[PDB]
Amino acid sequence: TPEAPPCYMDVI
Amino acid sequence: TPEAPPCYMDVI
Amino acid sequence: TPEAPPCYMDVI
Amino acid sequence: TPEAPPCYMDVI
Amino acid sequence: TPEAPPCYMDVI
Amino acid sequence: TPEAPPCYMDVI
Amino acid sequence: TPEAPPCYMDVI
Amino acid sequence: TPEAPPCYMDVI
Amino acid sequence: GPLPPGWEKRTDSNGRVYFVNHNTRITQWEDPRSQEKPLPEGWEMRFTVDGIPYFVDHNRRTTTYIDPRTGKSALD
Amino acid sequence: GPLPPGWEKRTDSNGRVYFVNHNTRITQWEDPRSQEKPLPEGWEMRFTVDGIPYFVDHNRRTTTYIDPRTGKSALD
Amino acid sequence: GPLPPGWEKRTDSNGRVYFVNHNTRITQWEDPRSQEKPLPEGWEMRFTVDGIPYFVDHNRRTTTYIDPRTGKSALD
Amino acid sequence: GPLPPGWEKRTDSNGRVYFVNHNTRITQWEDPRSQEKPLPEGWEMRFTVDGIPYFVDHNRRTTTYIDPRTGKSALD
Numbered sequence: 245t246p247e248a249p250p251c252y253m254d255v256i
Numbered sequence: 257t258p259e260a261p262p263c264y265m266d267v268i
Numbered sequence: 269t270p271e272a273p274p275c276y277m278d279v280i
Numbered sequence: 281t282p283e284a285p286p287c288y289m290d291v292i
Numbered sequence: 293t294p295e296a297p298p299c300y301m302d303v304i
Numbered sequence: 305t306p307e308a309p310p311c312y313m314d315v316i
Numbered sequence: 317t318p319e320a321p322p323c324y325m326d327v328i
Numbered sequence: 329t330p331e332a333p334p335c336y337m338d339v340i
Numbered sequence: 341g342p343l344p345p346g347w348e349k350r351t352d353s354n355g356r357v358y359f360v361n362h363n364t365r366i367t368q369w370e371d372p373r374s375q376e377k378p379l380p381e382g383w384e385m386r387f388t389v390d391g392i393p394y395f396v397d398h399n400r401r402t403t404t405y406i407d408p409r410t411g412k413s414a415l416d
Numbered sequence: 417g418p419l420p421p422g423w424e425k426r427t428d429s430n431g432r433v434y435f436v437n438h439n440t441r442i443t444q445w446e447d448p449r450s451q452e453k454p455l456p457e458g459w460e461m462r463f464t465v466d467g468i469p470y471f472v473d474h475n476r477r478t479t480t481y482i483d484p485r486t487g488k489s490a491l492d
Numbered sequence: 493g494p495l496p497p498g499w500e501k502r503t504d505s506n507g508r509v510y511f512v513n514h515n516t517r518i519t520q521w522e523d524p525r526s527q528e529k530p531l532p533e534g535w536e537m538r539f540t541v542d543g544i545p546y547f548v549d550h551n552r553r554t555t556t557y558i559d560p561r562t563g564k565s566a567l568d
Numbered sequence: 569g570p571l572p573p574g575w576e577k578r579t580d581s582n583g584r585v586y587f588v589n590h591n592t593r594i595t596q597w598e599d600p601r602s603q604e605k606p607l608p609e610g611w612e613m614r615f616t617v618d619g620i621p622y623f624v625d626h627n628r629r630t631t632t633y634i635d636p637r638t639g640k641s642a643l644d
Contacts, residue, residue: 248517249394251263260401272593273470275287284477296553297367299311308365309546320629321443323335332441333622345591346574362590363573366554402518421515422498438514439497442630478594
């Protein structure tokens with residue numbers, strides 16, 4: 245994990 | 257070609 | 269103030 | 281004879 | 293007319 | 305202070 | 317019987 | 329690692 | 341609530357209230373407890389499935405819950 | 417809630433969960449979100465009229481809302 | 493010198509070294525000890541008589557030695 | 569050097585100089601740049617092969633370069 249947001253390569 | 261660094265969750 | 273507690277010389 | 285330092289609120 | 297806030301050193 | 309830089313109204 | 321937690325370097 | 333000191337179980 | 345650590349509320353000669361950050365030695369008109377301001381160049385805001393903001397840094401190609409404008413986590 | 421900044425939950429070889437603070441490079445068994453521990457020598461705890469804890473440092477002859485054991489304010 | 497608190501050097505599957513900031517949960521290719529990057533909008537850099545950089549914030553109309561890009565003092 | 573962030577030097581009514589930490593709202597007689605004081609209960613100091621101090625916490629059974637009295641690294 246809850247501490248880390250979605251990963252860059254998964255969103256962009 | 258640029259490359260994103262490894263995802264925090266994949267790595268950690 | 270609300271940021272500072274009672275002063276040392278007032279309590280001791 | 282020891283002396284307390286000035287109170288935060290008296291000073292600030 | 294905008295006004296700058298007071299200088300740290302003038303104030304403090 | 306030596307902790308504070310020149311004031312905004314003195315430089316701009 | 318108490319146990320120390322894992323060493324930072326063994327773990328990380 | 330240089331960031332971590334000797335481990336507890338190695339020194340104690 | 342209380343001012344954040346290092347901050348003081350003061351009054352000037354004309355009776356105007358302003359705020360001082362002794363960590364950076366700035367002063368400012370706005371209360372730091374209040375709370376446009378653009379994200380820095382190369383950054384964007386997105387929302388998780390739960391509606392929580394997070395920050396995309398296209399410079400480094402990374403993501404964080406920590407708002408680069410404030411240093412505060414979107415989760416706090 | 418989330419772990420505080422710099423902390424990680426790990427699992428060891430026997431499957432035991434422990435916590436790592438990368439700011440200090442310690443590890444510990446207890447979750448840092450949970451949460452004896454005596455105050456340091458010369459300190460005492462008192463309560464305001466409102467029931468808020470504060471900390472009396474008899475060494476320096478001063479007072480603070482910031483718990484010297486944790487660095488956290490009694491007001492937060 | 494040592495990595496700053498909260499940072500770790502790691503190696504990926506291809507053997508490439510990268511850096512992790514557990515305070516923000518980012519990763520990045522560059523060593524944080526090394527170290528374009530523009531100042532945020534409305535800011536400028538100036539130098540004191542002694543050649544020390546400081547930062548002018550035209551948004552708030554204030555000045556500081558603390559670089560808003562890094563949170564580090566120009567005096568340290 | 570400069571005072572650490574959040575600290576101010578003041579003068580009292582009798583002309584005595586003292587120090588204020590706006591992060592904790594304490595005041596104290598000693599300059600914070602100068603810098604017993606015992607380690608907290610259960611801690612000991614040791615030295616590496618290189619003569620660098622580090623701190624052994626027998627409560628948690630861990631070690632760190634960060635002095636629990638100050639929050640400063642023995643490596644800085």
